[PDB]
Structure formats: structure tokens, C-alpha cells
Amino acid sequence: GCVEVDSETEAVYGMTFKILCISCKRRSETNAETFTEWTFRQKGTEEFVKILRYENEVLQLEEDERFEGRVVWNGSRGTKDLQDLSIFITNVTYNHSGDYECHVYRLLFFENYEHNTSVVKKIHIEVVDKANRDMASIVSEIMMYVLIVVLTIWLVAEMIYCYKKIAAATETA
Amino acid sequence: GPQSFVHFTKQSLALIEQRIAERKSKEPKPSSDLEAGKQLPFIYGDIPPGMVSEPLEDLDPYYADKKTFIVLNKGKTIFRFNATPALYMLSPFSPLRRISIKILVHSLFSMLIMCTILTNCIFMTMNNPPDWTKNVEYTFTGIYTFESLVKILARGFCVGEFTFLRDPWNWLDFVVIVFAYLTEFVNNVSALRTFRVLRALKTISVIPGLKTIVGALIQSVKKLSDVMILTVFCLSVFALIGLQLFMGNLKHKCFRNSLENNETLESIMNTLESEEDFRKYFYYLEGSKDALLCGFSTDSGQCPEGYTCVKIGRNPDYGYTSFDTFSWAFLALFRLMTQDYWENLYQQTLRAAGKTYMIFFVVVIFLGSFYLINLILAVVAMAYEEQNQANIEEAKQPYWIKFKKCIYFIVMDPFVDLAITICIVLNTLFMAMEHHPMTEEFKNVLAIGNLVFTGIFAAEMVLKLIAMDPYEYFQVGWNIFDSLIVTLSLVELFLLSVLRSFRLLRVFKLAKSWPTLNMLIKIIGNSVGALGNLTLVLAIIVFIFAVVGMQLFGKSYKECVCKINDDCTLPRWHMNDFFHSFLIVFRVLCGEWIETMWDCMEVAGQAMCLIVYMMVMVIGNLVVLNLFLALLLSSFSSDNLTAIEEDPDANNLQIAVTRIKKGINYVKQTLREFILKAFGKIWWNIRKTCYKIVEHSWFESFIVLMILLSSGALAFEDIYIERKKTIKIILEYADKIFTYIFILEMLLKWIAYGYKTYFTNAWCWLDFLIVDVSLVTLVANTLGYSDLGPIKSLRTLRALRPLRALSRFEGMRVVVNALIGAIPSIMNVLLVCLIFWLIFSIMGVNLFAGKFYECINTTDGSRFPASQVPNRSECFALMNVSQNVRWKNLKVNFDNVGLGYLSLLQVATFKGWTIIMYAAVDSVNVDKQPKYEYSLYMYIYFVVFIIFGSFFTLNLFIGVIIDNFNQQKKKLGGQDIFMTEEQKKYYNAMKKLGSKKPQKPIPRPGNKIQGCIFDLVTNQAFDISIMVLICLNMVTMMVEKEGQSQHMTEVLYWINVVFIILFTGECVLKLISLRHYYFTVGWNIFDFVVVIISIVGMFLADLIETYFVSPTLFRVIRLARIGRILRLVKGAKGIRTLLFALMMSLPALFNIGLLLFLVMFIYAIFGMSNFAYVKKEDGINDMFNFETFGNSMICLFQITTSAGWDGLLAPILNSKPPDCDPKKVHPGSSVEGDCGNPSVGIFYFVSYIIISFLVVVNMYIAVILENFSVATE
Ligand SMILES: CC(C)CCC[C@@H](C)[C@H]1CC[C@H]2[C@@H]3CC=C4C[C@@H](OC(=O)CCC(=O)O)CC[C@]4(C)[C@H]3CC[C@]12C
Ligand SMILES: *[C@@H]1O[C@H](CO)[C@@H](O[C@@H]2O[C@H](CO)[C@@H](O)[C@H](O)[C@H]2NC(C)=O)[C@H](O)[C@H]1NC(C)=O
Ligand SMILES: *[C@@H]1O[C@H](CO)[C@@H](O)[C@H](O)[C@H]1NC(C)=O
Ligand SMILES: *[C@@H]1O[C@H](CO)[C@@H](O)[C@H](O)[C@H]1NC(C)=O
Ligand SMILES: *[C@@H]1O[C@H](CO)[C@@H](O)[C@H](O)[C@H]1NC(C)=O
Ligand SMILES: *[C@@H]1O[C@H](CO)[C@@H](O)[C@H](O)[C@H]1NC(C)=O
Ligand SMILES: *[C@@H]1O[C@H](CO)[C@@H](O)[C@H](O)[C@H]1NC(C)=O
User: Fold this and answer.
1) Does A16 sit in the ligand 3 pocket, CB within 6 Å?
2) In sequence order, what are the beta bridge partners of B713?
3) Tell me, which fold does domain B532-638 have in CATH?
């Protein structure tokens, strides 16, 4: 169905990056008309500036140098009901580092009722020179080798002790 | 002896009166052979012509002193009368009484009465009789008056010892007569007519051998007294638990947040009448009659944005589905026990309260639905077995000649009969190739094949008719059947669709060589043979129930039709006419009554429909169960006695087999002859070391722990795995570690055991296969082949890791051993059932090939009428004119034989059968729009299939399974086959508990006050007073209801407090006169623990309700009140014995439950892997899917009972658009498409239901054996 996953917080300079914003309706069978607005605040600044707005299968970009010609819509396509409101940045630049808010406005159409609802989702993205490995992969791998080496020492050791004992029995025979 | 015969004269009466006078002045059981309504003994010989149907003396000496006489008819049946004049007017010697007695004992009299009753029963089936039937009813009344006039003046009326009113069955006739006359003279049709239905019950007193069956049924009922008491007690306890847990939960609804004109929920709720207006304020799913249920917890249903959950309005299902009061809770618990539509209630309760309450349904099902039904079944089986034992115990105590003879020589058993068997098999296989999208050439070849098969069969029949004499042809029943089939085939050739399917009956000819099919034929023959009376009684009961229901609710279904149908037309199931009433009765007997309950209570009131439906269920199920056990045991033991050898006459198939054995072997030997004419001490210690390591207990514990961890790691891989990156990475590395560990285990086992020993073990083979699949997957992942199609399909096989736990635990091992031992006997019956279901499937394909297509309006799913768009072409024009139109066909149908098999499986389980039934009865033709009940009488096909392919098929299966398990038990010395050795020791220790002799009595104490208290408590008066106090407490708990005022709450709280104080006082008094001997009795320990639990629970509940906000935990800890009423089983010995039998059955049930849980875990992992992204429709929705391990287990527990498996299977069957979307994009995941795989889903569900059936049957048998052992010892 629909799963709300968090966007990755790490971006590598000079490559591409996708900023996830997924907002799933509480009930899937309902119908709605959704449009999104993205706001970005750079480091060293305390004001949030709108950068894009997507509505009715057409993307509108604000006139900002940091995002002109390097943002495309990766998100729901073919529908006015959008549950993935994500964007992709084609060449990452240091200016892109900062905190981005996705505001989703959904009108839910019901019998005799329309409810207009809003969700704001916040992502912090840091541009970095080179990709950095997760602590969990680094910690897990070291633990898998330590468990595999520890088990092998217990089997080799137990066998050496048992063989010494069995050898005595044959001599005793 | 035979000469003891003389006419009854006045002198004999004078002598009898003189003997009576002598006996009075002075101031033994009659021969059962000479009892009334019995055959005259053969020792008396024939009857001289002049005394038949004449009054004679009493052959029974007992009555020789009293004034009685016997009359004999031409059938040597004796009848006992009284010599006292009838109403003091008619003497025995009077000619009028002579004529009355002549009429009374005669075959024509009984024939006339039977014909009258049958004709009246036929006339009872007309719901709107014409104006000409009044005279016929008057004639029936006159005939009944005539017959009741003969008897009344032949035996008198309540004046004699052998008079009219003493017969209990004569009271029915008198009531019929008086009711008819009184209602005629006084003049609702509903009641008076429904009362005239009693004339149908007179069939019992006129058809011979039916009174004995009715008496046997009453006797079988009488032995069920304790079981019904335990059933009512358990149902009431579970109803109280459900009332506590789910009080008012089914009233939660999604109420909108924004209300205009300053409107409130209270003000809204009193101005709402129609569902169209209710839909404007509450959230309804499309096409739903009830509002959507919600809950306040995180595991319950979720309201849409803009709606909030609130408890306001009525309950679902016309307000009949609730736990609001004790009555509705009891009805719901009875519904759960009978498993009628219980999945809907289960789903509603989970949505309204949360998924964590599946424990309540698991416990309730496993106890109320399984064990109580087992007890009823076992007790009725004991009753029938005892009746059979008593019955068998008391019973024992020219040129033409030349040529026609040449033809007889042509008839040779080894070849001709084998050829005919081959031809029958080939004809069945040929006729099984029909399908709907079938070209004209295929039709032509099928037609010519059927024609040639019919021709050769007719040639065989003619050749046999001219070989032996036509009189010689007709004694053999098989020959008569073959000739009848040939004439039917010829009649069809000269000319319906049903007649073409009468050729499939030739398959039963294989029973001469197939022993197991002959068992099924024997069961079917006994159904109308030795047990014909029971079947006739069942048919009479069904007819009476159908006509009674039609009379009671026929007009109500029509006047109040708009209450149960928006269109204001009669629904699919109703009682307006006889046929639909009979269909309702049959459906109830199948086990579906609540949905018709709702409509009946809506149209005609709760009380009448409830009473009628409960009576129908009780009587019908009792009769059906008695018939089932009768057939089962008769064909089990009485039919099979090895009287004759295996085919005493050399079977033609056996002769052919012997001829083949000679010929093939001789030819091969001659060919061989022609071919010959033409032409390490240290290594041994290592093996010793690895053996010591492998067999140690620490190795076993470590490997079991690793298996458990590896199996549990699979449950985490759900659709939310992308929110748990760390857990996902840990799982990948852990899987690598497990692969390494199991490689090491495999190497150690290879070294210790050797290749021969390791590969001669089945468990070792299974472990080797699993580890090989894991190693292949790991090496493919390492070598970069991680996205290949075959590799991705191989990766789903990690759901078979839990299979490694079978060899590690003894309970699953022994259960698996029993199952594998049973499999060979299961296979043959499975083949017989496949042949039978194939015959039915071919018939269904012939009847309904391609007729289930319809033109629907897609946006609302409503079939278009037949006045417009009656054809496929018109539907095509409508689609290309209007967008929301589709000419679709049912997913499960009778298009071919495989789809017919799936349809028959759905019908036999009674899950999804209604849609197929509606499509069949609406079917018209190929490329024709269906019309409402156009082929109305196609329901007979499904009824006949249900009877033959469920009742008799299950009978045969269980009969062979009993033999298989009895042989398994006998082979190993009679020990239980589902229990381990330690379990056997604990079972023996438990057995010693239930047979303890009376223990040493507790001595009195020396103190005077303590002695008085001692003689007080040990009195039985104390025990009975405590029992009635517990009953009053139970009633007080029953009084509670949803919406009660605060005053009632306070009153009930104070009453419960008083009861708690009284029980505490009882415990304190017991603690003084018993001293430390109080704890020497287990029941007293239980009483102490329940008193403590009650006090602590009520304190904690008060504390939480006063100084905390947690209703859920409040109810959970207030459930401790149930402990007090559980003490009622102490006073009742029978239910205590049944509970002891359950405790005995617990270990084997634990082992089988472990096996079932492992199978469920494997299937849950497979469902998570496969059907996680299937479209959410039919039985799949937001809360019941295969997205999560919890959801998968919720779904699988539901279908372990077969409940709602069709609704889960249906969404998976979508494979192509517009059914599904192959390129559907799911946010948060890379899986594309919501389509399902029909083959995988079908195999999944069919295999799971088959395995569940086998496991449930195993549990049934284990419980029944434990029940028989307890009662008969
Ligand atoms: C031993 C028991 C279990 C089965 C004995 C009977 C079989 C020989 C039957 C049962 C299912 C039958 C099949 C069911 C469905 C089909 C598909 C059918 O073709 C279609 O449905 C598509 C036609 C088209 O659109 O052109 C051709 C016959 C066939 C293979 C049937 C061939 C004969 C089968 C295998
Ligand atoms: C199928 O049903 C239609 C129902 O009318 C038959 O009638 C034809 O209907 C179409 C459009 O409604 C007209 O254009 C034709 O002139 C109608 N013909 C007749 C004879 O009424 C139509 O004949 C049927 N077709 C088949 C294949 O039976
Ligand atoms: C982005 O553009 C810069 C030039 O400004 C180029 O050097 C860099 O390689 C580009 N990165 C990608 C991924 O296209
Ligand atoms: C996102 O945009 C990139 C570049 O335009 C494109 O290659 C990628 O496929 C898009 N993904 C989605 C799902 O829109
Ligand atoms: C990014 O924005 C910063 C703002 O200080 C600017 O200095 C830098 O040149 C920009 N780089 C590009 C080309 O995106
Ligand atoms: C409340 O309802 C009354 C109905 O007459 C209306 O007159 C009033 O304006 C409402 N007030 C509010 C606060 O909406
Ligand atoms: C049916 O539908 C089309 C429009 O989609 C219509 O123009 C024409 O009459 C029909 N076309 C075909 C192919 O039958």
C-alpha cells in the first residue's frame, strides 16, 4: 500500500539526491485532491523561503539561483491525489545544505462534506564531499566476524579437548 | 401350541368374569413375542380361514385372567383390545363392533390412511390455494373423522385399559380432529393453518418402523443431559466475559467534525430516520448498509480525516449484533460456537476494539466450537453404540443356438471386460474436455467421440443380450443399470442438457475391481436400505419445518418486504413459497442461519423466528447426526465381515493381470534367450570426536535456539521494513551468520554419521535441502545475481526454515509420524472423492458453460435489466457508448473442469457458494444476459451435490480414518499415538488423580465452638446454600447491561460487595474448623485463591476507576469476578467428569497445536512474501491483509476454520486489467503492480485448507478417544 518512509539526511556533492516526502491518507479508499509546496532554509539564515509548488500535474519553480535548473519532480504522477510529494536535485551544491519543509494540502471529498487538511514534514539535508558509511553497517559487520570467529574457536577447542580424551580410551583398550 | 385357538364367546367372557371375581374374593410380565404390534410366532403355524379378523381368546396367560381379546389379520399381526363394552353400548359380539374391528385391522385401511396423509401433505405446499381446494380439505377432514370414529368405537375412549386415549400417538389424531372442527366452527390463517400442519406428523403412526426410530431419537436425546448443562454454563460464562469486554463497542461510528448551523451530535441523533440522511453525518463504505466501525486504540479501525470516533446510534445488522446485554451476548456466543458467519463478527469486534482481542476469539473458538461439539458428538456416538449393542445382543438371543453360443465364447473376461473398463475411462476423459471458449472443430470431434462411445456401448449391450437369454440378462443388477443407461443415451441421441450427463454413472462400474469405491456405494445403499426409516424420518422433519416456516412467515416476507430490501422486492432467501422455505431449511441444516435470522426477525418479530429457528436447528442437527453415525458404524462394522474371499469368482481384471504376468514375462525371457544366443586410526578418532559433539545436549540446545532465531527473523520482513534500516541490516548479517552455522552443522553431521547414514534419514534430507537452497541464494547474492527472476523466486523459499524445527521437538515428530502413517489410507479415499467430484464437475460444466457472463454497471456493480441489453452485442454497444459498462464473468465458475473443481470445493465448504448459486439460477444461455431466477430449479443440482459429495464423502473419509488410526494404535501395543513417553507418564499420573478412593475423613476438633462450626460447615446444607448463593451472584452479573443508569450501577456494586463479604466469611469459617486440613483439598485451595483474587481485583478496579483513566485494564482486571461463578462445577459431577476428560486430552492437543502453529507460521511468511501488495477488495481490506505478520496470522486463524477463504482468494485471482493494474506505484517501496498470481493463490489456499482439515480431524479423534476412555472406565 502506502508507507511513510523518512528521507535520507545525507547528500554527496556533485551527484544526484532525492528528498522523500510521503504522506499517506488515513484511509486508502477515500478520494482527495492534493497539492504540495516546498520551503527551504539554508544554514546561517533563520527565514524559510518557498522554492517550488506542484499542483495539477505541472511543476512551478521559484526564481532562486540555488535551485534553478536542478530540481525535477520525483513524486506521484498521473493523479490529483498525490501521496509521494518528493523532489530530486540533479546536481547537489553546498548551498543546498539546510532544512526543507514539505507542506501537503489535501482536500478530501466525502458525502456532503469536503475536509481540507494540511501536513508539514521536515527534512534536514547536509551536502558532504564523499559518501559516509552507516554506523550500523560498520558495527554489524564487525559483530558478524566476531561471532563467526568466536564460534569457530569453541568448535575447534571442544574438538581438541574431546579428541584428547577419546585417544586415551583407545590406548586403555 | 398351534391348537390353542378358539373364538371369543359369551361363555369365555363369563369364565373370565368368574375368575376375576374369584381373584377379588381371594384378596408377571407378558411374553414380548406376544406383545401388541408384533408378528405371531411361527410355532402357532397357519391360521384356519374362519377366525382371521375375528375376536378370539387371549394367548397371553397374564391377560387370560383379565377381560381382553385378540384379533388376527391375514398378516399374522396380533392386536390387543379390551372386552369391556365400548362406552357401555357396543358388545364384542355386536355386529357393528365386528365390522369396526374388521375395518381396523386391514392392509387397505392403512393404505388409505397413508394415501390420504400424503395427498394432504402435497396440498399443504400451496401458499395461495384456489377456491376448489375447500372441498378437498373437507374430504380429508371426513376421512380423518371416519378413521378416528372406527378406533374410538373399536377400543372405546379412556374407559378401558386398552382404549383409544391410552395410545400417546392417538392424542395427535384427536387434537387434529378437534382443532379442525373448532377452527371451522369458530370462523388467524397464520396460526390455524400452521396448526393444521400436525396432520403431517401422522406419518409416524401409519408407516411401520417409524415409531421405533422416533423412540431411539428420544433416547439419544435423553443421554445428552449433562452435556447441555455444561454447554449452557460455558456459553453463559463466555457471554459474561464478552459482555464485560465489549459492552457498547459495536456502536462506535465515524462522526464528522464540522457541523454547520450550530449543530451538535445530540441534536442530530434525534432527527435521523433514513440511511440516506445518516450517510451525510457518519462515514459509510460504498454499498454498506451499516456505518463503518472505529476504535480509540492504535490497533483498531481508523476514521478518515475529518471524522472522529464516537459511540452513538444502533448496532450493526439491524441492531442484532452486539454485546450490549446478556441476551445478545449469549446469542453471539452461540453463533461463535456454531461457527455461523463468525468471521464477520470477529472482524467487526477487532475493528471496534482492537487486534489485541483476537485472544478472546481464539480461546472461545478452541473451547466452545471445538470441545463442546466434540462432547456432543461423543455422547451421541456412545448412545448409538449402546443401542446397537443392545439390539444385536437381543437379536442373537438350431442355427440360432450355434451362433448365439459362438457369441458367448466371444465374451471373454480377461479381454472384453478390460476393454470395456478402458472404454469407460476413455469416455469419461473425453467428456471431461468440454469448455466454454470451444471452437466448432473441437465440438465436432467431441460429438463424434461421444457418438462412437455410445455406439460401442450399445453394441456391447446387444451382444450380451443375444449371448445370454433376455431373462438371463435381467437378474444381474449391473446389467439392468447398463441397459437403462444405454436406453437413456439412445433417447438423448434421438432428441436436454441434464440427460447428456447421465452417461457418467457408468464410472461406478469400476467398483467391481475398486474396493474403496464399493464402500461408498455400500454407504449410499445403506442410506436407503437398512437405514431407510431414519432417512424417511429426516425427510419428513425437513418437509414439516419447511411448510411450518412458509405458513408462519410467508405473508410477512411480502407485506414487510421493504424492511429487508431497498428495491422492495423479495430477497434471494425467503419463505414466501414452499421451494424457498425448503431452501432456507436446507441452508440452516448446512449451518447458515443468522443471516436469514435477521430478515425473519425484521419481517415477523424476534420471538417467533427465534423459537422456530432454534427448534429447526436442534431437531434437524440431532437427526442428521444420528443418521451420520448410523451410516458410519453400519458400513464400518456390519457390512464388512469378510464373509466371502477377495473376488470369490476370479475377477476379470485379476485374470487379465495374471495373463499379462504370464505373457510379458515369457516374452522378455524369450528375448533374453535370443540375445544370449546371438552373443586411518586418527581419522576414526576424528569420527569418534564429531559423534560425541553432535549427540550432546548442548549442541541440540544451541541448534534449536539458532533455528528459533532464524525462524523469528523472517517475521520482520513486512512492507514496513524500509522504516527500519538498522533492523534490516542486522537481519541480513544475521542471515549470513545462520547460513555459516548451518553449514558447520551439516559438515559435522556428515563427518559423524557418514554419507550412507546421513542420506538414509528423511530429517537429514530436509535439512540438507533447506541448507542447500540457503547456500545457493547466498552465493547468488555474493556473485551479484541478486535481481534475477529465478533467483528472486528462489528467495521466497526462506519461509521453509521453520520446517527444521519438526525434527527437534518430540510432539511435532510424533504427530508427523502419525500423519505419514495415515497418508496411504487417505490417498485412496482422496482418489475416490476426486472421481466423484469429477463426475459432478462434468455435469456442472455441461449445465453452466459460459452462462455466467453478465453486463454490469461498473461504478455501482449492478447488473443491467434484461429488457435493455439482453445480448453480448448490446453490451458491447453499451460499453462503447457508456464508459462504466463491462461484460464480465465470475472468477470462480464452471467454464472448465478445473474451475468446476474450484467451484465444487467452494460449495462443499459452504464459503462463496451463494454467488455461484445465484449465477446458476439466473443463467439463461451463452451470450445471453442472465434473468433473475430464470433457471430457478437449478438449486436441486447444488442440493444433490451437497448431499452426495459432502455427507457421504465425509462419512467414507472418517470411516477409513478410524480404521487407519485403530490399526496404528493396535500395532504399537495400544499406547496413545499423539503423546510422548514423558507425556504418557504424566497422563498416567493424571489418571491416578481421577480414580482416587475416598480419602481419610477430616477429624473434628476438641473445642466446643470449633466443633459446632465443624458440624456446620461439613453439612451438605452448607454446600447447597453456597451453590445457590453462587447462582444468585451469577444472576446479579447477568443483570448488567449497556446504558444502565448510575443507580443500577451502585445497587449492583453493593450487591457484589455483599457477596464478596459473604464468600470471605465462608473462607474464614472454613479456615478455623478445618485448620491446616483445609489446604489438603484442592477444591478448597481453588476457593481460597479465587476469594483472594476477587478481593484484590475489586480493590484494584475501584482504585483504577477512582484515581486513573484506563477502561481497558479496568475491564481486564474486573474479569476476575468470573472466578466466583466457576465454582459451580464443584457441585455438578457430570460436567466435572467432562472437564477431567478435557484435561486428559490437553497434552495431545498441545502437540497438535504446536504442529498447526508451525504450519501457520510458514504460511504466514509465504503470504507476507506473496500477497502483500494485492488490491484491497472483497475479504482484503485495511485491517485484514497480508502486509504484516500480525495481519497474516489474523487472516490465517480465520481460515483455519474455513471461514471466509473465498473472500481472501478472490482479490488474488486478478491477473490482468481492468481487474488489476500491473504498473501500480506503491509509495515507500519499489514493488510495482497490485495484481495477484492465480495459480500461487489457488495452491496456497487449497493446500492450507486441506492441511487444516487434516489437523482438525486429528484433534477431533484425539479428544474423542480421551472422552471414550474416561466415560467407559
Ligand atoms: C484425475 C482428475 C483429478 C482429473 C481428470 C480429468 C482431467 C483429464 C481434466 C481435468 C481438468 C481438465 C482441463 C481443464 C481446463 C482445460 C483448458 C481448456 O482450454 C481453455 O480453457 C481455453 C480455451 C480457449 O480459450 O481457446 C482445454 C482443456 C483443459 C486443458 C482440460 C483438459 C482435461 C483436464 C486436465
Ligand atoms: C441480441 O439482442 C438484441 C436486442 O434487441 C436483438 O435485437 C437487435 O437489437 C439491436 C439494437 O437494440 C438492433 O439494431 C437490431 O435490429 C435488433 N434486431 C432484432 C431482430 O430485434 C439482437 O438480434 C440480438 N442478437 C443476437 C446475436 O441474438
Ligand atoms: C553538475 O554540474 C556541474 C557543473 O556545474 C558538474 O561539474 C557536475 O558534474 C554535475 N553533476 C551531475 C551529477 O551532473
Ligand atoms: C526522478 O527524476 C529523475 C531525473 O529526471 C528520473 O531519472 C527518475 O526516474 C525520476 N524518478 C521518478 C520516480 O520520478
Ligand atoms: C550556491 O549558493 C551560494 C550562496 O552563497 C553561492 O555562493 C554559490 O556560488 C552557489 N553555487 C551554485 C553555483 O549553486
Ligand atoms: C447556536 O445556535 C443558535 C440556534 O438558534 C444560533 O442562533 C446561534 O447563532 C449559534 N451560536 C453559535 C456560537 O454558533
Ligand atoms: C465504439 O466506440 C467508439 C468510441 O470509443 C465509437 O466511435 C465507435 O462507434 C465504436 N468503435 C468500435 C471500434 O466499435
Assistant:
1) yes
2) none
3) Helix Hairpins (1.10.287)
